[PDB]
Design a protein around this ligand. Structure first.
Ligand SMILES: [Zn+2]
Ligand SMILES: [Zn+2]
Ligand SMILES: [Zn+2]
Ligand SMILES: [Zn+2]
Lengths: 308, 308
């Protein structure tokens, strides 16, 4: 059994976003909209429900941990369910949470060389946290092969490279390198059950579709419904392509991509506050569910039992 | 009228603390203890209830803003009640919140030279955030005199130096300098009403007591009940003196110090998860209230009407 817990299901900024008054955010606050608040994207993985691997440490980590009981096993006066942390990129909304874990150092942190570079220079979390009882102990994620974290020895992680898009603070933001971003394939080696986790997906190719067809659950980028969604809401100018996010709708959208995966479980995650699928009464929500695709929410539990 | 909003009232780690199972934290989670959850220390100030000055940006800032309606005036599709931010030190639990405000840059940030140094080197928030639409615009807090933030032109801030204790990440942590920590005197220049804000107070002297007697509301360090409180709970070794916090109890404690201030309003803030005054049925809580001292809580509103 592979346990997948959705701690946070929103894109950066959360839902509602602190400074946003778009139709969703303002409608939520006014109570005129049927939607559920969401923290910034993070999931927890486990092969026993007791030892947990964190994927991305969101700025909302304190509320996310508190909301999920297994994160506090209470086996001693100081204790936690986090046995390791995996970073998919060096972005601020995926790493800031580590600062809130300073009281429980050391932590094993798995990330690529490029991400380790960013996090020892432009956002030197490793340098900062090292003053707290050994800080973060780096474990290198290689750009080939797989890795196993001893706390969950039945989980086999196979990372795959995504289009390099280093954070704006990154010394090499204008110089993208392989290792800047990745998606995860996670396999329960006892059953064969595979999770495909790609919260940040800007493009698909043949190699990608091939490994998706080998997976049992598809947990993918659901940031924007339309590529110019920020313009439509009137709260920004950046497109989904500029942000490295494939929209759900239109030709080449994820919904069209997901049509070739009828047998896989399909869940949209990392959803922006502007996305209509957050409105549970939207025709966009209805279309998603009509296509057999789920919309992730904070507290969602995905059980991965076996392999197709 | 001076409005003071308590966004967060706990010391670092919050209450409950993510990794802590002391009598308070575990008792809260079990529901066997009568206590209220608290986010990490931060207050908001205003002279009109519309424009707000943030003091310290806690890691819990997203939940703190969402919980206080004036933080979202909803005057445009993107908007906020934060018009300026004041930092009292460069500690992680007082500055991390700034990262969560990247979507609404630029922000005016007021802090001392020493704090600006830390935040451009060991924790280079200013360097990181500058890639977000102008980032943080530094306004120097001088170690003498006062300053006025134009958004709240009736609020006069007079900072006062506290014992220098630079954060562990700080290049000059072993070399403390004046400007590392300060407390605030805030005056409504229309009424004369003064707030004394010293969330981090490790020692008192004659100069300190003299300016406290000139204030109307005393909002001070309430981290530990006892100096060896971390040892008593069994969750650490550090003392309140090692942490730069004066305990409430015993000779020289804050309660004894506050006895010489019968006319002032007295509120304890920045309270550690281990502190018995969090237990609303504790004899420690009872003693505090018996001495005319209040225990701050998340969402507390303090109205400063006039001067004694
Ligand atoms: Zn994100
Ligand atoms: Zn919005
Ligand atoms: Zn603090
Ligand atoms: Zn505790």
């Amino acid at each position: 059994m592979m346990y997948i817990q959705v701690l946070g299901s929103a894109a950066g900024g959360g839902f509602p976003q602190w400074n946003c008054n778009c139709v969703n955010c303002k409608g939520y606050r006014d109570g005129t909209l049927k939607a559920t608040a969401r923290t910034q994207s993070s999931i927890a993985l486990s092969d026993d429900g007791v030892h947990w691997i964190l994927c991305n440490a969101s700025p909302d980590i304190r509320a996310q941990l508190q909301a999920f009981a297994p994160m506090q096993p209470a086996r001693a006066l100081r204790d936690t369910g986090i046995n390791a942390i995996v970073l998919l990129d060096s972005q601020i909304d995926h790493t800031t949470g580590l600062l809130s874990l300073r009281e429980g150092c050391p932590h094993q942190v798995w990330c690529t060389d490029m991400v380790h570079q960013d996090l020892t220079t432009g956002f030197p979390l490793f340098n900062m946290l090292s003053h707290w009882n050994g800080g973060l102990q780096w474990n290198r994620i290689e750009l080939e092969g797989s890795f196993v974290i001893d706390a969950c020895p039945n989980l086999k992680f196979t990372p795959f490279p995504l289009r390099s898009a280093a954070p704006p603070y990154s010394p090499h933001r204008f110089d993208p390198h392989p290792g800047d971003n990745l998606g995860l394939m996670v396999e329960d080696t006892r059953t064969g059950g595979k999770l495909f986790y790609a919260p940040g997906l800007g493009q698909v190719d043949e190699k990608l579709l091939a490994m998706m067809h080998g997976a049992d659950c598809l947990l993918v980028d659901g940031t924007l419904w339309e590529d110019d969604e920020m313009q439509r809401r009137g709260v920004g100018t950046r497109t989904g392509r500029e942000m490295g996010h494939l929209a759900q709708n239109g030709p080449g959208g994820t919904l069209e991509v997901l049509d070739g995966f009828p047998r896989q479980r399909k869940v949209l995650i990392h959803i922006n506050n502007t996305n209509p699928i957050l409105d549970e009464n939207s025709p966009e929500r209805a279309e998603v569910l009509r296509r057999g695709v789920e919309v992730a929410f904070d507290g969602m539990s995905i059980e991965l039992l076996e392999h197709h």
